[PDB]
Amino acid sequence: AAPGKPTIAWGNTKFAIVEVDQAATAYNNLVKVKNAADVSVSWNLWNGDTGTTAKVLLNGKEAWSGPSTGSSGTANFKVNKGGRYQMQVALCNADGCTASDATEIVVADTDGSHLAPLKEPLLEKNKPYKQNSGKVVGSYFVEWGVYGRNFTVDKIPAQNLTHLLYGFIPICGGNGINDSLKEIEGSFQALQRSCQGREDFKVSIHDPFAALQKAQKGVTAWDDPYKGNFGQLMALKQAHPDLKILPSIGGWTLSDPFFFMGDKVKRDRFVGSVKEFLQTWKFFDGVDIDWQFPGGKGANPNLGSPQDGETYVLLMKELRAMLDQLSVETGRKYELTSAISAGKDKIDKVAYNVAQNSMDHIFLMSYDFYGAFDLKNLGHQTALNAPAWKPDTAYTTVNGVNALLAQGVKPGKIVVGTAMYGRGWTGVNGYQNNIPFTGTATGPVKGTWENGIVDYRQIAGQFMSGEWQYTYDATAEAPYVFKPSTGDLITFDDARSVQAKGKYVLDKQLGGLFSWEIDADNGDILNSMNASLGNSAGVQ
């Protein structure tokens, strides 16, 4: 007679190809990429002949086989593809094979192949758009937004984006290499613990708790291997297979290491660490380089060199070569992008007409033109055009686009920036003709999270009522709210100025729109980005 039917033993059924060490704070120890997951299964036979061969099947296909030598057994074998499998133990002899009932086993990998899709409802004022314009619709999500800002990946209106950038992935390095980080409390030290035992100029994760271990919707079980932002992003990729999710390296406080990359030893170490990062975290679709800024004038007053433009061009070509190689290894398309200053004084330190041949998209940061970093010279922080009272204004969106176009950059590469925040001042005074921007200020406005900066959500929620004046400057294409009794002045984008940027993109055949930062919108900004670029309302 065939053997008795085995009963799978109770036991762990959740396994991982990329293992996460739950008692590690250094990035080198935190993750272990294997070529396959170590899986184990045990069984008992409660009734009958135990057969002479035992086999473990996954969806019918043998993963392990060995002699059946008694009423219980254990099998250890490797599974090299992530996903969920119906696993069975079968005992076989010459008269037949008798298979257990199926037990599902979960083999995790960092493409999210083990996860359910995270397809959450649109919140606040977000309305559904189809991505069918062919234009970029991008936004940044910030790793530290999950604490006080309380804005997690399940709150991103992800159907309404083509590109979701993750700010920020840091480059390892202590004194002299990430000194701008010392301005943020506990931040420099944070990085040094993440990078313990790890060479400088390799990438790491700045806050491993937020990125991988904090409990979040859909990744709450103790033994879900990837939680935090990265676990949710993997499940978001399962819901939106064509969303491009890019890791952004740098930003205002993490850009110092780029200034050392004229040393090709360091540059090559960095490039190889990026390749390793994308091999490890398979949900990411490329890399975004946010070096602020080639030539200096970023957070660190002691850095910046005439060499930086060449380094930026070489970095991009070598990034693209690495990604082209990773693309043919995997069959995947990988993207290389960069977010760049929109000021013409910074643009012309780089030959973007050469660097564009390595890049998919250039995220033109057409925001922060003005703000509480200068109390004397006030202006619209993200306007399309100069205002009527100063038609020679240097920092406008059009001037940064035109500086790029004058280099020879193809218009289709250029993605125009929209701000989901305002900048502002307090004590504005001494202005003519009811235009507060002709005055000077005494300090920054009271921010939502930091001085001088206000989420758009709060502008709409609190500063479009009461004593606040609202004006849409149709020359500049820029809204502003002003409280005459305190002299609080806030410059921001709103649905109409975004619509102007969107029509301008379509008119000039530019690449699309992106925004900083997704948590600060109530829906009005991203709704307008989508509509102004010609995406149809609704779902596919």
Ligand X SMILES: CC(=O)N[C@@H]1[C@@H](O)[C@H](O[C@@H]2O[C@H](CO)[C@@H](O[C@@H]3O[C@H](CO)[C@@H](O[C@@H]4O[C@H](CO)[C@@H](O[C@@H]5O[C@H](CO)[C@@H](O[C@@H]6O[C@H](CO)[C@@H](O[C@@H]7O[C@H](CO)[C@@H](O[C@@H]8O[C@H](CO)[C@@H](O)[C@H](O)[C@H]8NC(C)=O)[C@H](O)[C@H]7NC(C)=O)[C@H](O)[C@H]6NC(C)=O)[C@H](O)[C@H]5NC(C)=O)[C@H](O)[C@H]4NC(C)=O)[C@H](O)[C@H]3NC(C)=O)[C@H](O)[C@H]2NC(C)=O)[C@@H](CO)O[C@H]1O
Sign of the torsion formed by the C-alpha atoms of 347, 348, 353 and 358: negative
| Interaction between residue 149 and ligand X (CB under 6 A) | yes
| Interaction between residue 186 and ligand X (CB under 6 A) | yes
| Interaction between residue 458 and ligand X (CB under 6 A) | no
Query: CB 526 → ligand X: shortest distance, Å?
Result: 16
Rounded-to-integer distance, Cα 352 and Cα 354, Å: 5
How many helices (H) and strands (E) would you count in the chain? Answer: 12, 25
| Interaction between residue 31 and ligand X (CB under 6 A) | no
Rounded-to-integer distance, Cα 340 and Cα 250, Å: 11
Q: Which of 88, 103, 133, 292 binds ligand X (CB under 6 A)?
A: 292
Q: Given the complex with ligand X, which of 378 and 453 has the nearer CB atom? A: 453
| Interaction between residue 77 and ligand X (CB under 6 A) | no
Query: CB 33 → ligand X: shortest distance, Å?
Result: 25
* Interface stretch with ligand X, choices 182-190, 264-272, 484-492, 498-506 (CB under 6 A): 182-190
* Interface stretch with ligand X, choices 2-10, 21-29, 335-343, 475-483 (CB under 6 A): 335-343
Are 208 and 27 within 8 A, CB to CB?
yes
Q: Given the complex with ligand X, which of 56 and 153 has the nearer CB atom? A: 153
| Interaction between residue 187 and ligand X (CB under 6 A) | yes
| Interaction between residue 184 and ligand X (CB under 6 A) | yes
Query: CB 343 → ligand X: shortest distance, Å?
Result: 3
Tell me which residues in 230-289 interact with ligand X (CB under 6 A).
251-254
| Interaction between residue 147 and ligand X (CB under 6 A) | yes
| DSSP strand pairing (103-108 vs 72-79) | unpaired
| Interaction between residue 166 and ligand X (CB under 6 A) | no
Q: Which of 79, 339, 409, 500 binds ligand X (CB under 6 A)?
A: 339
Q: Given the complex with ligand X, which of 89 and 365 has the nearer CB atom? A: 365
Query: CB 150 → ligand X: shortest distance, Å?
Result: 8
| Interaction between residue 190 and ligand X (CB under 6 A) | yes
- Note the helical H segments in 366-465: 397-407, 456-462
| Interaction between residue 163 and ligand X (CB under 6 A) | no
Are 456 and 525 within 8 A, CB to CB?
yes
Two tokens, residue 86: 């119906």
- Note the helical H segments in 463-520: 495-508
Tell me which residues in 419-448 interact with ligand X (CB under 6 A).
421
Q: How many positions of this chain bind ligand X (CB under 6 A)?
A: 35
Q: Which of 139, 341, 515, 532 binds ligand X (CB under 6 A)?
A: 341
Query: CB 419 → ligand X: shortest distance, Å?
Result: 8
| Interaction between residue 301 and ligand X (CB under 6 A) | no
* Residue reference for tokens 């922080």: 381
DSSP 210: I
| DSSP H/E element including 319 | helix 308-330
Rounded-to-integer distance, Cα 292 and Cα 80, Å: 40
Q: Which of 77, 209, 389, 468 binds ligand X (CB under 6 A)?
A: 209
Q: Which of 224, 256, 360, 517 binds ligand X (CB under 6 A)?
A: 517
Query: CB 405 → ligand X: shortest distance, Å?
Result: 17
What are the distances in angstroms from CA 58 to CA 50, 62, 69, 118, 369?
A: 20, 6, 22, 26, 58
Long-range CB contacts (within 8 A, 24+) of 394-397: 394/343, 394/344, 395/342, 395/343, 395/369, 395/370, 396/366, 396/369, 396/476, 397/342, 397/364, 397/366, 397/501, 397/504
Q: Given the complex with ligand X, which of 254 and 271 has the nearer CB atom? A: 254
Tell me which residues in 361-380 interact with ligand X (CB under 6 A).
365, 368-369, 373
Long-range CB contacts (within 8 A, 24+) of 83-88: 83/107, 83/113, 83/114, 84/114, 85/58, 85/59, 86/58, 86/59, 87/8, 87/13, 87/41, 87/56, 87/57, 87/58, 88/8, 88/56, 88/57, 88/60
Give the three-state DSSP class for 232. Answer: helix
| Interaction between residue 490 and ligand X (CB under 6 A) | no
Q: Given the complex with ligand X, which of 144 and 312 has the nearer CB atom? A: 144
Give the bridge partners for 169, in sequence order. 249
* Interface stretch with ligand X, choices 128-136, 139-147, 401-409, 437-445 (CB under 6 A): 139-147
Rounded-to-integer distance, Cα 125 and Cα 270, Å: 41
Q: Which of 67, 70, 121, 148 binds ligand X (CB under 6 A)?
A: 148
Rounded-to-integer distance, Cα 503 and Cα 508, Å: 8
Are 432 and 380 within 8 A, CB to CB?
no
Sheet arrangement for strand 72-79: 7-8, 37-44, 72-79
* Interface stretch with ligand X, choices 141-149, 229-237, 310-318, 480-488 (CB under 6 A): 141-149
| Interaction between residue 141 and ligand X (CB under 6 A) | no
| Interaction between residue 290 and ligand X (CB under 6 A) | yes
| Interaction between residue 211 and ligand X (CB under 6 A) | no
| Interaction between residue 111 and ligand X (CB under 6 A) | no
- Describe the crossing of helices 524-532 and 495-508 by its angle, rounded to 10 degrees: 20
In the complex, the residues that contact ligand X under the rule CB under 6 A are: 140, 144, 147-149, 168, 184-187, 190, 207, 209, 214, 251-254, 290, 292, 339, 341, 343, 346, 365, 368-369, 373, 395, 421, 449-450, 453, 516-517
